[PDB]
Amino acid sequence: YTRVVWCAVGPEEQKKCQQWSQQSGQNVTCATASTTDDCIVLVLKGEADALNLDGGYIYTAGKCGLVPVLAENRKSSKHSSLDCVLRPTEGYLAVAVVKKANEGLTWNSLKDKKSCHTAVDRTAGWNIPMGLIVNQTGSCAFDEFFSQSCAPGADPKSRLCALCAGDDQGLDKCVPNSKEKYYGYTGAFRCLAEDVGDVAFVKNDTVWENTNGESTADWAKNLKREDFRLLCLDGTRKPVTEAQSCHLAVAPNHAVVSRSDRAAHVEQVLLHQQALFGKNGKNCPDKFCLFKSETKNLLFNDNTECLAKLGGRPTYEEYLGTEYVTAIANLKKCSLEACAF
Numbered sequence: 001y002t003r004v005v006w007c008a009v010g011p012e013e014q015k016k017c018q019q020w021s022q023q024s025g026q027n028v029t030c031a032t033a034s035t036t037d038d039c040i041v042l043v044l045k046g047e048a049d050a051l052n053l054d055g056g057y058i059y060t061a062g063k064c065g066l067v068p069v070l071a072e073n074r075k076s077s078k079h080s081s082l083d084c085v086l087r088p089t090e091g092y093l094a095v096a097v098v099k100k101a102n103e104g105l106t107w108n109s110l111k112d113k114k115s116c117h118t119a120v121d122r123t124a125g126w127n128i129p130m131g132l133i134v135n136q137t138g139s140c141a142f143d144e145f146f147s148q149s150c151a152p153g154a155d156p157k158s159r160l161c162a163l164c165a166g167d168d169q170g171l172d173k174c175v176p177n178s179k180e181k182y183y184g185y186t187g188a189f190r191c192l193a194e195d196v197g198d199v200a201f202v203k204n205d206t207v208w209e210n211t212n213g214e215s216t217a218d219w220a221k222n223l224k225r226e227d228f229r230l231l232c233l234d235g236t237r238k239p240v241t242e243a244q245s246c247h248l249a250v251a252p253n254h255a256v257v258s259r260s261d262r263a264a265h266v267e268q269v270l271l272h273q274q275a276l277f278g279k280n281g282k283n284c285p286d287k288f289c290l291f292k293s294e295t296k297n298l299l300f301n302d303n304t305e306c307l308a309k310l311g312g313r314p315t316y317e318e319y320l321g322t323e324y325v326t327a328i329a330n331l332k333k334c335s336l337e338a339c340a341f
């Protein structure tokens, strides 16, 4: 009766979803697609109920009538009088990161460098950076700005995919899911960290979580914060402790979307599910933790304290906010009123 079907993007998210399915006694079951767009389509058709989405994809979904239900909330110091579910979301900081050893590389000398993006169409990895670049460049030729990138979801044979490495067999180069090595917040940072690219467009937290022994991953275990720098828009370079004053934009938190006709039901199940598997849920860490996966951010970002309700029942434009929505529209005219499917 009250059963929810989650959409997992790619083989690893399917594996996590299945565990979750099992531990929930089929209160949640799983559907799989190779890309976030495919999962959006599955939701429209009614074959899936929900997935957690980056702001860039909430924009897509939004045009097709899908709606934000619940947002991720991470560790905060302000709003400490309030419980997590009821506490408003801050927004994450979009940053540009570089090696310190790579002296003299600033925001103004990025043309023809090698870039690492989370995936085409994501907030911190794509829409913020390339929105700014098109702006400053007065040109829609963003495919020709960098010498080489890894931008999962771009044409595998374009220079936007040249730096992507596919999976362990080298198959699936540039797929916009975690089979791709340099995919997402951790993939894009790893891409910089191994000096495949010169710059990585991630969020503030990605640097903190994958340096100073925070990640046990073989590529990251020796990584040290002092070896990185943030590129500011004013042409300067700051340590990674200055994010508050050296970021490209503040971004709306990843959120769970569903078809409006399903939103109420999806919300109800999710709140009960996190009671069970959230930050101090009954069965976490004993049996299963919804917000854990070894720094792989599967289904959810690993730093999610809880999923929060949304005051003022916002629409998707209200949720993303006007400044962000205009930026995406302006960028989309480079390559108005219609669902993309």
Ligand SMILES: *[C@@H]1O[C@H](CO)[C@@H](O[C@@H]2O[C@H](CO)[C@@H](O)[C@H](O)[C@H]2NC(C)=O)[C@H](O)[C@H]1NC(C)=O
Pocket: 075, 076, 077, 093, 204, 205, 208, 209, 242, 243, 244, 245, 303
């Ligand atoms: C950058 O992200 C980090 C990590 O998400 C933020 O810092 C942490 O914040 C909480 C509360 O302030 C602390 O209790 C944690 O222990 C911190 N984590 C780590 C790993 O240092 C930081 O606030 C963010 N900064 C900006 C500018 O957004």
Ligand SMILES: O=C(O)Cc1c[nH]c2ccccc12
Pocket: 089, 090, 091, 092, 251, 252, 253, 318, 319, 320, 321, 322
């Ligand atoms: O809560 C968020 O993270 C997103 C958000 C909702 N309304 C906004 C208005 C301006 C900027 C960001 C947001």
Ligand SMILES: [Fe+3]
Pocket: 054, 055, 122, 123, 124, 251, 254
């Ligand atoms: Fe994001």
Ligand SMILES: [Zn+2]
Pocket: 247, 249, 250
């Ligand atoms: Zn700012």
Ligand SMILES: [Zn+2]
Pocket: 312, 313, 314, 315, 318
């Ligand atoms: Zn409203």
